[PDB]
Structure formats: structure tokens, C-alpha cells
Amino acid sequence: PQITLWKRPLVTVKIGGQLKEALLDTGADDTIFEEMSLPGRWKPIMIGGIGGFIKVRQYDQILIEICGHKAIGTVLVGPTPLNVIGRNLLTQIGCTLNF
Amino acid sequence: PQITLWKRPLVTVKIGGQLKEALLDTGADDTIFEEMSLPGRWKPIMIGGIGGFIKVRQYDQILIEICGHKAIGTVLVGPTPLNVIGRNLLTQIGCTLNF
Ligand SMILES: CCC[C@@]1(CCc2ccccc2)CC(O)=C([C@H](CC)c2cccc(NS(=O)(=O)c3ccc(C(F)(F)F)cn3)c2)C(=O)O1
């Protein structure tokens, strides 16, 4: 679709068999979800943004679907204030910024 | 322009007659810049990032040229990993998300 930015660009995403609301964030290098269960192996890492750093669990090769678009990539899990879809996954659904 | 997301959406901006780099960030409600001088009076604001909360200084009606487009709006100044253009100015330059 074409999404205006008058409000936060929140979308429904299918991940780990659940439906969840997530923010489309062009400034995020990576994708971070609040605490949730995901399959497979993970490692602890540290990511930073406004307000500093948080420790998160890195899961690789995770399937996502955003508005009918399927993708696969790394998904992080930890104490983010909300679920955020970052560029590693926005590219895969063919998301661009236009003006 | 159409900006893809394989790299960080960093653009050159002109603020206070100076050239600076800033991130185009649809995940940010607001625009925040690293410590700098801006004209006029300021008000106190607290904002959340993925790392937690920071206190910032809020300046109104600040002229900023973003990738050659003029915007005049609210600019926050505080401790940030980098300069961030949020939705308040992304909307002024006519930016949408497309996929
Ligand atoms: C001005 C605050 C902006 C924002 C708001 C989050 C929010 C939204 C609604 C409610 C509450 C909070 C969105 C955002 O993109 C980031 C940063 C990038 C600037 C962010 C987001 C997601 C992940 C990261 N970590 S990272 O390792 O993937 C990373 C590290 C650095 C950068 C860099 F480009 F900013 F340097 C981008 N990404 C950072 C953030 O920390 O908070």
C-alpha cells in the first residue's frame, strides 16, 4: 500500500504463528519484538537507540508476513517499548520511502 | 526521490545555515538533533526510544532543508545516537511509505 505519516505506521504482522501490531521503522537497522517465544537457536546481543542500550535475544531465519508480503530474516527479542520492523525486513517486502 | 532501505536512509540536511547528516526515521514521532544552538525559547520534553527515556529541549518553528525540501517545525535537542528526522517533518516534505 501507500502509507501516510500523519500517524505512527502500525501494521499487523504474522510471526511465530501469532498476529501482532508492529511499527514500520525506516531508521531501525534491525527488527525487535517485545518478549515472545520463537523457534530455534539464539544468542544474546546488545542493541542501542534513543535512550541507550538493551540486551536482546537474536533469532535467525525467522518467517514474517506483513500485509500479504512474506519475508525471512533475523528477529530480535527483548525489552523494546513496542514491536518494530527494521530495515533488514522492510527491504524484503519491497518497502521504500517516497517524496 | 524514492529511497530504498538496503542502507541507512541518511541524508544531508541544512539547519542553522550548516550542513548535517540525519536519518529519515518513520519510527520517530519527532525530530531530534545532537547538542547544537537553536534560536528562541525552549520547553522541556521527555521522549522514549528503544533504549529508554531521555529529556530534551523543544524548539518551535525551526527552518530545516531536508534533501532540498524546506520544512519549518519542531526540533528537539538532546542526547541521541545521531540526528533523526521524524514524522513531524517527514509529513511536511510529502514523504510516504510504499510497498
Ligand atoms: C527518536 C526516537 C525514535 C525511536 C522511537 C521508538 C518508539 C516508538 C513509539 C513508542 C516508543 C518508542 C525509533 C527508532 O528508530 C530508534 C532507533 C534508531 C534511531 C532504533 C530503533 C530500533 C532498533 C535500534 N537498534 S539497532 O541496533 O537496530 C540500530 C542502531 C543504530 C541505528 C542508527 F542508525 F540510528 F544509528 C539504527 N538501528 C535503534 C529509537 O530508539 O526510537
> Which superfamily, in CATH terms, is the homologous superfamily of chain A?
Acid Proteases
Distance between the termini of chain A: 15 Å
Query: Structural class per helix/strand content of chain A?
Result: mainly beta
CATH structural fold name of chain A: Cathepsin D, subunit A, domain 1
- Cα-atom radius of gyration of chain A: 13 Å
- Report helical residue fraction of chain A: under 10%
Topology:
Two copies of one chain form a homodimer.
Chain A lengths: L1 E2 L6 E6 L2 E7 L7 E2 L8 E8 L2 E15 L2 E9 L6 E2 L1 H4 L5 E3 L1
Parallel strand pairs in A: 3-8, 4-7
Antiparallel strand pairs in A: 2-3, 2-6, 5-6, 6-7
The structure holds ligand TPV.
Subunit structure (chains A, B): Homodimer, whose active site consists of two apposed aspartic acid residues.
Organism (chains A, B): Human immunodeficiency virus type 1 group M subtype B (isolate BRU/LAI)
Protein name (chains A, B): Protease
What does this structure look like?
The structure is a homodimer of 99-residue chains. With 99 residues, chain A is mostly beta strands. The first copy, chain A, has a single domain, classed as Cathepsin D, subunit A, domain 1 (Beta Barrel), CATH 2.40.70. In chain A, 4% of the residues lie in helices and 55% in strands. Chain A is built from one helix and nine strands. In chain A, strands 2, 3, 4, 5, 6, 7 and 8 form a seven-stranded mixed β-sheet that branches. In chain A, a hairpin with a 2-residue loop joins strand 6 and strand 7 (69-77). The first copy, chain A, is globular, with a radius of gyration of 13 Å. The first copy, chain A, starts with a strand and ends with a strand. Bound molecules: ligand TPV. The ligand CCC[C@@]1(CCc2ccccc2)CC(O)=C([C@H](CC)c2cccc(NS(=O)(=O)c3ccc(C(F)(F)F)cn3)c2)C(=O)O1 sits between chains A (23, 25, 27-30, 32, 47-50, 81-82, 84, 86) and B (8, 23, 25, 27-28, 32, 47-51, 81-82, 84). It is classed as viral protein. Keywords: protease, Viral Protein. It forms a dimeric assembly. Crystal Structure of HIV-1 Protease (TRM Mutant) in Complex with Tipranavir. Chains A, B: protease.
